[PDB]
Design a protein around this nucleic acid. Structure first.
Ligand SMILES: [Zn+2]
Ligand SMILES: [Zn+2]
Length: 42
DNA sequence: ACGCC
């Protein structure tokens, strides 16, 4: 199971989501980096 | 279980 990193529903990932994507990161939400690069960690 | 309007 998964939760989307866009709309945030369950049973699909951001790729599989209907909706268009968000800018910057998705995890924390900050720009410059993407959620794979993201490493803020509090 | 994951990105590129
Ligand atoms: Zn979604
Ligand atoms: Zn981030």
């Amino acid at each position: 199971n998964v939760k989307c990193f866009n709309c945030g529903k369950e049973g699909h990932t951001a790729r599989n989501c209907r909706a268009p994507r968000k800018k910057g990161c998705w995890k924390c939400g900050k720009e410059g980096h993407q959620m794979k690069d993201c490493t803020e960690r509090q």
